[PDB]
Amino acid sequence: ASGWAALGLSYKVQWPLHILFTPAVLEKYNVVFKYLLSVRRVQAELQHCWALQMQRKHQTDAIKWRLRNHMAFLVDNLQYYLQVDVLESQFSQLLHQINSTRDFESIRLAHDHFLSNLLAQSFILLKPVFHCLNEILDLCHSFCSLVSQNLGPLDERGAAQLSILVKGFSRQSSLLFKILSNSDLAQLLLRL
Amino acid sequence: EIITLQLGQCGNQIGFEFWKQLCAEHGISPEGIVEEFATEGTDRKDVFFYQADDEHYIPRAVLLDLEPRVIHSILNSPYAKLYNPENIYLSEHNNWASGFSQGEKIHEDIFDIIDREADGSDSLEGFVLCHSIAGGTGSGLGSYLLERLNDRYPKKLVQTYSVFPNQDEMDVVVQPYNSLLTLKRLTQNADCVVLDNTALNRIATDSFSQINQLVSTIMSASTTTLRYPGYMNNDLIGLIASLIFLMTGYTPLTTDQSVASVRKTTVLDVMRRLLQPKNVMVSTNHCYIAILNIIQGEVDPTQVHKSLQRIRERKLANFIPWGPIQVALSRKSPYLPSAHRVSGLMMANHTSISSLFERTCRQYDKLRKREAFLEQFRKEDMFKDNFDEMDTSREIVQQLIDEY
Amino acid sequence: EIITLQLGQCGNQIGFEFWKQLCAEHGISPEGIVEEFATEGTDRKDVFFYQADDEHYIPRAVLLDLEPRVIHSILNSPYAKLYNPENIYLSEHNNWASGFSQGEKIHEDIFDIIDREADGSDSLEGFVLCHSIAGGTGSGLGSYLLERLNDRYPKKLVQTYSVFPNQDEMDVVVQPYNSLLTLKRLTQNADCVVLDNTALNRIATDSFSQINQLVSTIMSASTTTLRYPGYMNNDLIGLIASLIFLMTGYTPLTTDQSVASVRKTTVLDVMRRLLQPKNVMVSTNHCYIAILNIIQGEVDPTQVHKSLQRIRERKLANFIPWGPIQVALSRKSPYLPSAHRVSGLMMANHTSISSLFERTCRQYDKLRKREAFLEQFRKEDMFKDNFDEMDTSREIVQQLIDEY
Amino acid sequence: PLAAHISLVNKAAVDYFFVELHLEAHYEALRHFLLMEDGEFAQSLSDLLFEKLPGELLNPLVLNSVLSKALQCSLHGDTPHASNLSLALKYLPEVPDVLSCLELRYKVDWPLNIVITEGCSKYSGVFSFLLQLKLMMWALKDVCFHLKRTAMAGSVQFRQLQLFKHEMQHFVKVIQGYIANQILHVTWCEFRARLALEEIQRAHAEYLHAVFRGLLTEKAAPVMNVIHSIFSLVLKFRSQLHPNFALMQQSYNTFKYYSHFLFKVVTKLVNRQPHLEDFLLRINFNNY
């Protein structure tokens, strides 16, 4: 059991908003923080490797790294987009529904619908995509470690381990492609 | 955090106007005081400045120069008191060999200053270098500093804004040697922004004060998101990884008098404009390697997606056949007027830049066959015996061109 | 409590400016009166001053000199009335032998004065000596006083601020003899601060008034914590035990005009600066024996620990292989402006100091082979018969160098 | 109509303590005397008592009077606060060790006795340690001063001997520098910017609970047990003030072993206390 899998952030709410932020709604928030941190963890990890490949400027097969790294980069970096454009877009509606209706009953529903959209838009509830991209997540952990766990060319069974993932990654890559072929239109457009 | 190493008259000025732009953006008074309206500011200041017990902010800058006049004039400016007198260094008393010899001679004090500045930052990220590659001062001194820095600090980034000599205009008669050697050092040690007077002044048309104001604009717009934290691209290494020689372009390069045409400026039109060779501030089906567009002001990601889709369909760009852009968004400083509804800056890596070196190589080969102006070089120790340094540098540049 | 014995023109001045600094720090009026703002002061004054029934404070100082002119000028200063006329002594009417002969001649009155001063203190801790080792007055008189004092008072500390002759500059033609003899006496009797004009003026550059102002600054900063009681290091013996020849350095050695650069001054940067050979005010993989850093101003022990950790990892220093530093903190006087956010003084014992004697020995050996300027020495009784004193002194210094 | 009056009483109750009875003064005064923060007082009290060393030094004619002679040399105090320093004892010693049991109790009056508890007795727990520390920096100062009069006599037996003192003194001057950072400065930063009626009882019960960072807690007691082995060997080093050089050479070698054992027992106790973290950075610096 890795430590990151259990990490979370709780919030001691004050008295007035005690009615608006129940342990139920404050829990779905936590699930978003668990996932969004993971993608942040792999991205920050992945780019550090790039900070080394460019750094490693002084093998005809070692060049397969960046020809896989960038493939694993674009799928991740742009997956990390649609996030600044599902947060800053759904949030900008949640704040607008507040300053419009003098009623309070709307806030309990506007905020509630705002939360359900994040779980729906960010594909956290959609099981198939969430069980396929998840494989892409831990996939980069293996690759990034492989480049960092040494400083020489991939000869000591690294290349033997390298060609393992590309047969799965590129398979996982086009596997996702058929899945998207309602909400994916905003996402698949960027990759394509 | 970051450090700035500016050399030669070019670098000294570049730094002057870069810090002018920075203090304008962050609401820093000329004397280092903070304005009342900016007391509650949210902008991050540690990146380029460190505050002082007197509440004033000091740049993480060091001034280097073989001659006093430029910096002496700087210290007579209204911005004089801002800089740190301790960091500034002036030689007590135009060739690359001489510059490198002095660099060997004055190692100790320079690295003393650099270490003092470095130890004041918890999370230093890299280095910034501003210099010209033609003149004797910038070329040689930057060469020496880059060598000894890459040796000293093997875990810090090294970014440069290297100014290249004009070619259509026949300035340094001995420019080919200095340029070639500086390029050798840049390939052999530099982590990562090419600059030329020719195309820069071309776009300026169509004094050094205005040229370098534009250059400082480019630098500041490049560092904006780092200065202003957001969601993505929250580090210089993130920038470098997403691209890796570079060239740059900025859309709203408009005079203070050219605001009369308040043209409805979408994101699509800007990002389009950043692609044309005209806006590329620098002067075989050559193609791109990478493109980054940082956009300031209100921006709808739907608009960005639509612009990307349309440009992709219109195939206005060409890419490498052997490998599979990026559009980042930032926020303008809350102080400078937003005369532009939305603005765009582009940094790209494109193969055509190779031509630059082919010219300089052609220039250098056009001299080495007749041994022109080598008398001064033989004087210095480095070229006292032979010039194998020159041959190695030329072959390295040739190898880089072949690789491109 | 403590006593100060200053000899020769050098010592006389040293004392003048040292007491100037002290009275400035403790808010003591030039006439010995106490200012109104300092009436409720918490600073301890007994250490260097004793108050009088007239409410004025008198220094625990004695003035000695072979010539009147210097002290006569002192008594024409605005600070003249402060000193005790009883303690001051002037010879009624440049050689070490002559100085020691006079010391033998004027034993009685000098020790009368010293005893009178001593009996006025309950908890006298040691002695302070300020003198120059080259000139005839300081060298010989200090020799005689040290001998007869170590004989008289076998339970008191003896601290000296010995000024060494410039060497790059070819001042006393007979300096080797006086220096060698004074060093003999220092090893044979002195409990524990070397000083040289060469490096002192070097740092001053990069009149005697300013040089000795710096020296007095060093002395006062050394005695600060004793003057200002805290938690640790509440006694001179605590200082000595933590180290035991010495050399010194002070970071904020800045002109009154060089306050314009208010550089954000951490504790780390200061303590770092105290290590460089440049700041060591004095001019075989030689290494350290001990290091002490006294820090004035606001200080967080977490910062101190971090600085110590980083310096230890960076291994900027070298230590003895056969044996296993110290960072003490004090409080600034509440009166003098705190132009420096945090300031640092360093006293260290380092093996390289040996070189000093090797020079002087080389100087002395460069004369004893030809019997230069011995005519005057033969005049005095001590060197009337022979010069075995000289041979013993030279061998003692050689033994000390071998021990180092 | 009730809570509106509760806040006004309590705010007027706490304010009554500071601006009228000087509660802020008593704390910053007991620290001047008990925790030995004010120099020239502990350096004058301990220095007097240590000059003697049974039937002497135990009657109320010397120890009940040495205090009234100590306060005069304090140059800070001699106020109504400065009184009430009952320098009493709690044991009758019979007869080289590092123990001299002796208490020092403050005294208060009615409107302040209700806050400062008669159990917060724990100062006397942390005091007897701090005084015991002074016994080193004086006895060790003695041998540093006792050797000074021995100086002509320069040989390998001499210089190699004095290096032991510099090697043993530095270990005491670093463990003291630790105490002068935790129990007097950082634990005082809290409880000073923490204050500004029930809370005063708990806040004070949290300030002193100084005994945790002081290595007096039974949890980290094995770390304290090793300190005695160090302090004991320095006392033996003071007994042999070169007729018996080798007898001292064996003593120092025992000192270098125990110190080398401390660095391991503290490291093993890191996995199981952020307070102890700063100790290893103090005892170890460019070594192992």
Curated annotation (Swiss-Prot), chain A:
Ranges that cross the membrane: none
Localisation: Cytoplasm, Cytoskeleton, Microtubule organizing center, Centrosome
Origin: domain of life: Eukaryota
Tissue: Ubiquitously expressed.
Family per similarity comment: Belongs to the TUBGCP family.
Function noted in UniProt: Component of the gamma-tubulin ring complex (gTuRC) which mediates microtubule nucleation. The gTuRC regulates the minus-end nucleation of alpha-beta tubulin heterodimers that grow into microtubule protafilaments, a critical step in centrosome duplication and spindle formation.
Subunit structure as annotated in this protein's UniProt entry: Component of the gamma-tubulin ring complex (gTuRC) consisting of TUBGCP2, TUBGCP3, TUBGCP4, TUBGCP5 and TUBGCP6 and gamma-tubulin TUBG1 or TUBG2. TUBGCP2, TUBGCP3, TUBGCP4, TUBGCP5 and TUBGCP6 assemble in a 5:5:2:1:1 stoichiometry; each is associated with a gamma-tubulin, thereby arranging 14 gamma-tubulins in a helical manner. Gamma-tubulin at the first position is blocked by TUBGCP3 at the last position, allowing 13 protafilaments to grow into a microtubule.
Name recorded for this polypeptide: Gamma-tubulin complex component 4
Covered range of the whole protein: 447 to 649 of 667
UniProtKB/Swiss-Prot annotation, chains B, C:
Major site of localization recorded for this protein: cytoplasm
Binding site for GTP: A134, G135, G136, T137, G138, S139, G140
An example molecular function term from Gene Ontology annotations: identical protein binding
Subcellular location: Cytoplasm, Cytoskeleton, Microtubule organizing center, Centrosome; Cytoplasm, Cytoskeleton, Spindle
Keywords, in A-Z order: Cytoplasm, Cytoskeleton, Disease variant, GTP-binding, Lissencephaly, Microtubule, Nucleotide-binding, Phosphoprotein
Post-translational modification: Phosphorylation at Ser-123 by BRSK1 regulates centrosome duplication, possibly by mediating relocation of gamma-tubulin and its associated proteins from the cytoplasm to the centrosome.
SUPFAM superfamilies, per database record: Tubulin C-terminal domain-like, Tubulin nucleotide-binding domain-like
Highest taxon of the lineage: Eukaryota
A GO cellular-component term linked to this record: gamma-tubulin ring complex
Outcome reported for the amino acid change (mutating L356P): In CDCBM4; the chaperonin-dependent folding and hence the yield of monomeric gamma-tubulin is compromised
GO biological process terms on file: cytoplasmic microtubule organization; meiotic spindle organization; microtubule cytoskeleton organization; microtubule nucleation; mitotic cell cycle; mitotic sister chromatid segregation; mitotic spindle organization
SMART domains, A to Z: Tubulin, Tubulin_C
Parts forming coiled coils: none
In-chain residues carrying the UniProt-annotated modification Phosphoserine: S123
Record note on quaternary structure: Component of the gamma-tubulin ring complex (gTuRC) consisting of TUBGCP2, TUBGCP3, TUBGCP4, TUBGCP5 and TUBGCP6 and gamma-tubulin TUBG1 or TUBG2. TUBGCP2, TUBGCP3, TUBGCP4, TUBGCP5 and TUBGCP6 assemble in a 5:5:2:1:1 stoichiometry; each is associated with a gamma-tubulin, thereby arranging 14 gamma-tubulins in a helical manner. Gamma-tubulin at the first position is blocked by TUBGCP3 at the last position, allowing 13 protafilaments to grow into a microtubule.
Disease: Cortical dysplasia, complex, with other brain malformations 4: A disorder of aberrant neuronal migration and disturbed axonal guidance. Clinical features include early-onset seizures, microcephaly, spastic tetraplegia, and various malformations of cortical development, such as agyria, posterior or frontal pachygyria, thick cortex, and subcortical band heterotopia and thin corpus callosum in some patients.
Entry similarity comment: Belongs to the tubulin family.
Role according to the record: Tubulin is the major constituent of microtubules, protein filaments consisting of alpha- and beta-tubulin heterodimers. Gamma-tubulin is a key component of the gamma-tubulin ring complex (gTuRC) which mediates microtubule nucleation. The gTuRC regulates the minus-end nucleation of alpha-beta tubulin heterodimers that grow into microtubule protafilaments, a critical step in centrosome duplication and spindle formation.
PANTHER family assigned to the protein according to its UniProt record, in alphabetical order: TUBULIN
Name assigned to this protein: Tubulin gamma-1 chain
Gene that encodes the chain: TUBG1
